[PDB]
Design a protein around this ligand. Structure first.
Ligand SMILES: Nc1ncnc2c1ncn2[C@@H]1O[C@H](OCP(=O)(O)OP(=O)(O)OP(=O)(O)O)C=C1F
Ligand SMILES: [Mg+2]
Ligand SMILES: [Mg+2]
Lengths: 412, 555
DNA sequence: GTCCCTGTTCGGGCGCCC
DNA sequence: TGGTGGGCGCCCGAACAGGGACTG
């Protein structure tokens, strides 16, 4: 016996009209089972073509599992939905969560079906289940409850969420519980063991109203600083690269100067000629190398503006990333390491990289970054879902990155 | 009969009104067709005589059907369609024979007057107002509206397709193991039942359909392999396409060509080897569908190649879910590619061709990665899994590319096939500067005003050249300079550029380009033994980039 | 700002199905 | 003979969308 709360689109905007992409047999079989079940439970309803909207659906098989999770891609509906977010939330972001020894992530998606959705908004949550080899036209549903993965779902359910959490927070003050979309982030400084014991204990209170992973250790995350090569002899080539790197880096740290080095290269020299470094050049190289230590000054997180993430493939399983909102104004620079084997899958690796990076962003600023992916669109969109494990999905775009920036952030 | 199914609610778009567009002049043979159609439809409640309370109207005409005996009443709702709301189409794609499994028993059913069996929303019927012009001394004459779905309206296909799915749901739920491929009003029904139990099951399907207002005449494909379905003919163990006949016009025009490609493309789903590059190229700036043009010695050549492959007989087979899927790809020319998909060695499931040009510059490995992509997505639609690949490219060549390439690129589980032509990289840029190779500092400037330019180099060994170009661009003058350096250097060469544009194109190892300049650069690069491209920031006094810069800047 | 150059989307035509 | 609809596919040209380099 609960009342529906009205929700609207941003002015001048219409609901999503995004075509469903091809799904593998295993996924379609799972969706058809999940959906028949959600239809019984009255949580979604079948609809016709006269509803003009659409949003893609797929499915994932979390960890080693025989349990699938429906995943509706709502980031277009979310992009379009009333600023519910920056208006109807009294929510600051738990600054301490990023410091916590161990954070665990919980999938409180089920909790949302317990609330109905504004009848007038239902139209916009439509999706379409494909069949194999198009044996059938698509089967279309719209939501009746709060959709998982929708921006309005934590907002509408905020208060009810507070009620349930409230008593748990009171008895555990040093446990910080943060919520993002379908996600509950739970951090503590408990000995690994007592922490899980305590987590199982929150999940015990959570079974009381009705009706994942892995394990995060935020304070072990760290930054990948820009760094200069150290050589016992330098070639014209070695120095030409070095000046270019510094020159660009000076756009980030304005303390970097390249003049004394740039004058070891006067004339028209062969690339493999060795130039011994003059006292100044040598010292100036030492200045810069330290300047790079210093933290980037003057960088302030603005929630109104969107988070940009860039990723460069460094090869041999290395990946480097930066998070900025304004050019050269990085909030965080990192690298992601992975298996150096022979059977490396770049695309798997890229999507594990975006999930890690997204995860850090949520934990640190409680927001999702817009990624610039160094992959071809079609390639990326062919496989990324075979590797996804998050319940959210970040915005993205694909880019042809200059072989320059890849070296700017390179490691040693 | 009319289906007792609930209607689908249908609006005009806000602010708009219904069509007021008067009939046009209709043939005598078709008015005879149209009234005979209408008076029976109206007996059956499918349409209703309207009166002058109905402001609206929309033109009508009549074409024949497949057999060419029956007539089809179309309505040109071009205006109403613009005025009608949007739909989401539910037909996501086109079923394919190669995705069918072997069944013991097969039936193909068609529904009679399909559209005219589904009710149209009551509130919307008044916009479908049309008028039959009758013989001109015996009435103005007759005016009708639709109570069922019209043929020419933008919403009919999707409302039919959705209404059918609704209607079949109970049967499908009751018969989870009879497979019904559903295409518009087309039904293919397969079972693992024996002929006579299948028959009984088919009649149940028909009673079920008929309870919902859908009739099935014959037109019932029975103990009748080969079945005619979707433009194919299916036999128990093999499928093939109904005959394809390419035109033979001697003067070819755009429109003639565009339909030569069409049938060829269509053809390529099971005739291996088809190519249409040259032909498609004919069709460039030709601003008119009528424009004729001679088939280039190259094109007229190509046309004759396919034209030969269609002469040989060919079938596909059906899909065994317990064997693997295998895509084999082979290389042609001009970024043209063919593939075949099978589970057993010489038994095609189907085939196809990839041949897009993605990008102004590229190479075989990329184009191969893209055909892989295409085929993968296609397999997921048809069989819902990914095939294993047999590719004409060495594991080594792959690893080199993926180690050099700064993008994330990947190919599914695959295996090499000695079938030439093999896919190769035609050259490899050095990682380190080359000892004992002359060092070229190149640069070009262009005067954005005049369009005049200079490309040129200066070398550590004292040589320097400057070339004035006319009608150029910075990026061009800068590519030109690299081209000068390659031209005048030995088999090994270091080149230092300040242009990211150029470095970016060349780094990525193109072997084809839309740009002749880049093509020439490519010929040069492949001829060389070692090349090392280094970059430096411009206008920083670095030498001897400073030297070339002063030199090509006489503008 | 202006050029460039490259990528994308969209529409149009043709094929095929109904 | 003209003249209708929706789906997918293929090409090609349009319009954009970006980045990078320029001017003085
Ligand atoms: N050229 C077209 N323009 C617009 N719409 C078209 C067109 N060609 C097909 N259609 C749609 O397909 C449907 O065709 C169904 P079939 O062709 O099996 O015929 P029947 O009327 O259902 O009955 P029967 O089997 O008793 O003859 C009806 C439509 F309107
Ligand atoms: Mg029919
Ligand atoms: Mg230059």
């Amino acid at each position: 016996p609960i009342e529906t709360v009205p929700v609207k689109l941003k002015p001048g905007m219409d609901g999503p009209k995004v075509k469903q992409w091809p799904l593998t047999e295993e996924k379609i079989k799972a969706l058809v089972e999940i959906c028949t079940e959600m239809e019984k439970e009255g949580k979604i309803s079948k609809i016709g073509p006269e509803n003009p909207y659409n949003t893609p659906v797929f499915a994932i098989k979390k960890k080693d599992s025989t349990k699938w999770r429906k995943l509706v891609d709502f980031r277009e509906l979310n992009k379009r939905t009333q600023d519910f977010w920056e208006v109807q939330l009294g929510i600051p972001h738990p600054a301490g969560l990023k410091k916590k020894k161990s954070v665990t992530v919980l999938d409180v998606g089920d909790a949302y079906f317990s609330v109905p959705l504004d009848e007038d908004f239902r139209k916009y949550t439509a999706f379409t289940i494909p069949s194999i080899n198009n044996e059938t036209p698509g089967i279309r549903y719209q939501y009746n409850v709060l959709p998982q993965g929708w921006k309005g779902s934590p907002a509408i359910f905020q208060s009810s969420m507070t009620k349930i959490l409230e008593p748990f927070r009171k008895q555990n003050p040093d446990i910080v519980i943060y919520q993002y979309m379908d996600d509950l982030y739970v951090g503590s400084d408990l000995e690994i063991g007592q922490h899980r014991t305590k987590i199982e204990e929150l999940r015990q209170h959570l079974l009381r109203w009705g009706l994942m992973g892995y394990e995060l250790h935020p304070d072990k995350w760290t930054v990948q600083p820009i760094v200069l090569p150290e050589k016992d002899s330098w070639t014209v080539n070695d120095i030409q690269k070095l000046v270019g790197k510094l020159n660009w880096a000076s756009q980030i740290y304005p303390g970097i100067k390249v003049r004394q080095l740039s004058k070891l290269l006067r004339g028209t020299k062969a690339l493999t000629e060795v130039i011994p470094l003059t006292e100044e050049a040598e010292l100036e190289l030492a200045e810069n190398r330290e300047i790079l230590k210093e933290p980037v000054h003057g960088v302030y997180y603005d929630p109104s503006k969107d988070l940009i993430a860039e990723i460069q493939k460094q090869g041999q399983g290395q990946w480097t990333y930066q998070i900025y909102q304004e050019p050269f104004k990085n909030l965080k620079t990192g690298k992601y390491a992975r298996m150096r084997g022979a059977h490396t899958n770049d695309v798997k690796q890229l999507t594990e990289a975006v999930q890690k990076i997204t995860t850090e962003s949520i934990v640190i600023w409680g927001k999702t970054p817009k990624f610039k992916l160094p992959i071809q669109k079609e390639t990326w969109e062919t496989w990324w879902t075979e590797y996804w494990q998050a319940t959210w999905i970040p915005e993205w775009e694909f880019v042809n990155t200059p072989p320059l920036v890849k070296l700017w952030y390179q490691l040693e | 009969p009319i289906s007792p199914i609930e209607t689908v609610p249908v609006k005009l778009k806000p602010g708009m009104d219904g069509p007021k567009v008067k009939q046009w002049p209709l043939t005598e043979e078709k008015i005879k067709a149209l009234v005979e159609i209408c008076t029976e439809m109206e007996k059956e409640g499918k349409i209703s005589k309207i009166g002058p309370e109905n402001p609206y109207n929309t033109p009508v005409f009549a074409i024949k059907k497949k057999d060419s005996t029956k007539w089809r009443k179309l309505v040109d709702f071009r205006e109403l369609n613009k005025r009608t709301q949007d739909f989401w189409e539910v037909q996501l794609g086109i079923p394919h024979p190669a995705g069918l499994k072997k069944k013991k028993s097969v039936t193909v059913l068609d529904v009679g007057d399909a559209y005219f069996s589904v009710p149209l929303d009551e509130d919307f019927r008044k916009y479908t107002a049309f008028t039959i012009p009758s013989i001109n001394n015996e009435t103005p004459g007759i005016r009708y509206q639709y109570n069922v779905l019209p043929q020419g309206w933008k919403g009919s296909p999707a409302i039919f397709q959705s209404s059918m799915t609704k209607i079949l749901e109970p049967f499908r739920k009751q018969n989870p193991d009879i497979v019904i491929y559903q295409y518009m009003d087309d039904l293919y029904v397969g079972s693992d039942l024996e002929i006579g139990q299948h028959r009984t099951k088919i009649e149940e399907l028909r009673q079920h359909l008929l309870r919902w207002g859908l009739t099935t005449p014959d037109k019932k494909h029975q103990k009748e392999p080969p079945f005619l379905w979707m433009g194919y003919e299916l036999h128990p163990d093999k499928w093939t396409v109904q005959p394809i006949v390419l035109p033979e016009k001697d003067s070819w025009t755009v429109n003639d060509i565009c339909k030569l490609v069409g049938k060829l493309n269509w053809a390529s789903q099971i005739y291996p080897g088809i190519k249409v590059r040259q032909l498609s190229k004919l069709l460039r700036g030709t601003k008119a569908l009528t424009e004729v043009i001679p088939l280039t010695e190259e094109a007229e050549l190509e046309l004759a190649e396919n034209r030969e492959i269609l002469k040989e007989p060919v079938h596909g087979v059906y899909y065994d879910p317990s064997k693997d899927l295998i895509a084999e790809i082979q290389k042609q020319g001009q970024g043209q590619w063919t593939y075949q998909i099978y589970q057993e060695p010489f038994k095609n499931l189907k085939t196809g061709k990839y041949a897009r040009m993605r990008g102004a510059h590229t190479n075989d490995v990329k184009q191969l990665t893209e055909a892989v992509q295409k085929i993968t997505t296609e397999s997921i639609v048809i069989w819902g899994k990914t095939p294993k690949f047999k590719l004409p490219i060495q594991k080594e060549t792959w690893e080199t590319w993926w180690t050099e390439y700064w993008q994330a690129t990947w190919i599914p589980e695959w295996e090499f096939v000695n079938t030439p032509p093999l896919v190769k990289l035609w050259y490899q840029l050095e990682k380190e500067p080359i000892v004992g190779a002359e060092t070229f500092y190149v640069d070009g400037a262009a005067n954005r005003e005049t369009k005049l330019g200079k490309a040129g180099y200066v070398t550590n060994r004292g040589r320097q050249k400057v070339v004035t170009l006319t009608d150029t661009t910075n990026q061009k003058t800068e590519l030109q300079a690299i081209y000068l350096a390659l031209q005048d250097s030995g088999l090994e060469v270091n080149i230092v550029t300040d242009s990211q544009y150029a470095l970016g194109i060349i780094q990525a190892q193109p072997d084809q380009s839309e740009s002749e300049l880049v093509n020439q650069i490519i010929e040069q690069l492949i001829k060389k033994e070692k090349v090392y491209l280094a970059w430096v920031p411009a206008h920083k006094g670095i030498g001897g980039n400073e030297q070339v810069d002063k030199l090509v800047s006489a503008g």
